[PDB]
Structure 1
């Protein structure tokens, strides 16, 4: 009853797409680079944005028409194309072809309104904060418009605190921070502020991995243990105690256990050897799928310890 109508309509759609595709290839072979091609491809690309040859056909048409149309006619075509693209992105926001066509179009305009494109990105990131295509496009727009890293840094903070799904936003921060502090390895005052920010994040949502991955990076981005300032030493010891408190709240949370180990390494590997081994045992019991990783990590750390003990005068 209800399934045959669905089978038949989808058969009709396929016949239309095939006919329209046939028409486009025939027009192309005939050298007919005109608006009828734009009409035909619009019927196909909405549902099938990965049909790359059809995006190429649209570009050939737009290039041809630019040569023969008034500047005002050409501007009208560009605006129609921007609207078509946005309607396509709303249906399928994860198509490489659609985002590339938008990049191609914007890159050739006199002309372009980049602030409006940044807003298009903000809108799509509100819908899906993990859409890498949209983040990549945002990076493109920001480079084209010469948006300052500090501005982009303020954007990431708002996205990290307003809700979760933060891996993409933490990633962006990891790229922006070294720009605000560019060396030919973050400065400690910067690092300490980041540690504060990320620690807020993993105490708010201890289950999400993004803050824990970012934190591990931060723990390597600094001075070195033999170089710890009293402030940094004190901050890392405070973090160690806070992770132990989280361990009590969430006994199945493997991220906090791993981080306890990494903090002890950052503070004093030999002094904390006993506790490090104890934590590896607990952690392997809590996260058994990672047991081989954890054994290799422990082996690495024990070899580091041997080398440290052999340095002994």
Structure 2
């Protein structure tokens, strides 16, 4: 039953491909190839050579046709692309074919492209092809860091398809300005907030470790000591919070907190046994760091 109708399809794809190649060596760069590849690419967007062919036709027709007949072909092509992306929203060549197409338009509608990224991110908020194409579009349309950072601020808070959006933030932020103390402590806030909502959403934690890695100051040491307690209240079996406390104590006074650093490593191993070997090496590295530090005493 189902084999019939899908041997039907293979037959037709298989003959269409043949005819496309025949046409190609002969050099029939025409509408007939656009029509044949349409058949094929619609069912198989990863057939890269066919996006190549389309491109060559459109460029060949692009001259020996009226700028009205060209324009019709561009519109026809954008809708074919979108229809292909709804089929395979991960196709590298489908997305890059749209990149080529938009890049060569004399007057491209980027707002419509950004809306398309919206739609695709609604379907799959982690689709990295779409985030890339979004950054392509934001750069072609010179969208400014703060506009994008609002878009990101609306796709983390409302909903938690977070990591791809917090990454984008990570890149957009430095573009507003070893990142400023004032901004750092402001992000320590947004992130310390983040992990009292879902302390088991990991984006905030990954992000916060960057923020620590990247003067103590009464201002900062107090925010870190504060963080450390906020974290201890939260410990009332969350591995991310436990690692962070070790790293905060490390951040604060590693010689002073050596005892507690060791306690924490123990609890953390029991909570996150898969990371036993990492945590051992991290503990060894801290212990050595400390022995170096104790040799600062005379």
Asked if these proteins are the same fold (TM beyond 0.5), I'd say yes
> How far is 1:165 from its partner?
2.1
CA distance in 2 between counterparts of 1:98 and 1:73 reads 23
> Runs of at least 4 residues of structure 1 off by over 3 A?
none
Q: Which runs of 5+ in 2 are unaligned?
A: none
> How far is 1:47 from its partner?
2.1
CA distance in 2 between counterparts of 1:44 and 1:200 reads 50
Match of 2:148 in 1: 152
CA distance in 2 between counterparts of 1:36 and 1:92 reads 24
Q: Which runs of 5+ in 1 are unaligned?
A: 222-226
Deviations 1:27-51 (A, max 9, x none): 1111111111111111111221111
Secondary structure of 2:21's match?
helix
Secondary structure of 1:162's match?
coil
CA distance in 2 between counterparts of 1:165 and 1:142 reads 20
Which residue of 37, 46, 49 maps to 1:41?
Answer: 37
Secondary structure of 2:43's match?
coil
RMSD: 1.1
> How far is 1:277 from its partner?
0.4
CA distance in 1 between counterparts of 2:203 and 2:55 reads 39
What TM-score, normalized by structure 2, do the two folds share? 0.97
Deviations 1:42-90 (A, max 9, x none): 1111221111111101101100011111111111111111111111111
CA distance in 1 between counterparts of 2:115 and 2:283 reads 47
Which residue of 254, 264, 280 maps to 1:295?
Answer: 280
The more displaced of 205-214 and 291-300 is: 205-214
1:80-91 to 2 correspondences below 5 Å: 80-91=76-87
1:172-211 to 2 correspondences below 5 Å: 172-181=168-177, 185-211=178-204
CA distance in 1 between counterparts of 2:248 and 2:43 reads 51
Deviations 1:242-293 (A, max 9, x none): 111221xxxx321111111111111111111111100001111111111110
CA distance in 1 between counterparts of 2:234 and 2:123 reads 31
Secondary structure of 2:196's match?
helix
CA distance in 2 between counterparts of 1:299 and 1:206 reads 27
Match of 1:138 in 2: 134
1:215-230 to 2 correspondences below 5 Å: 215-221=208-214, 227-230=215-218
| Residue correspondences, number | 297
> How far is 1:121 from its partner?
0.9
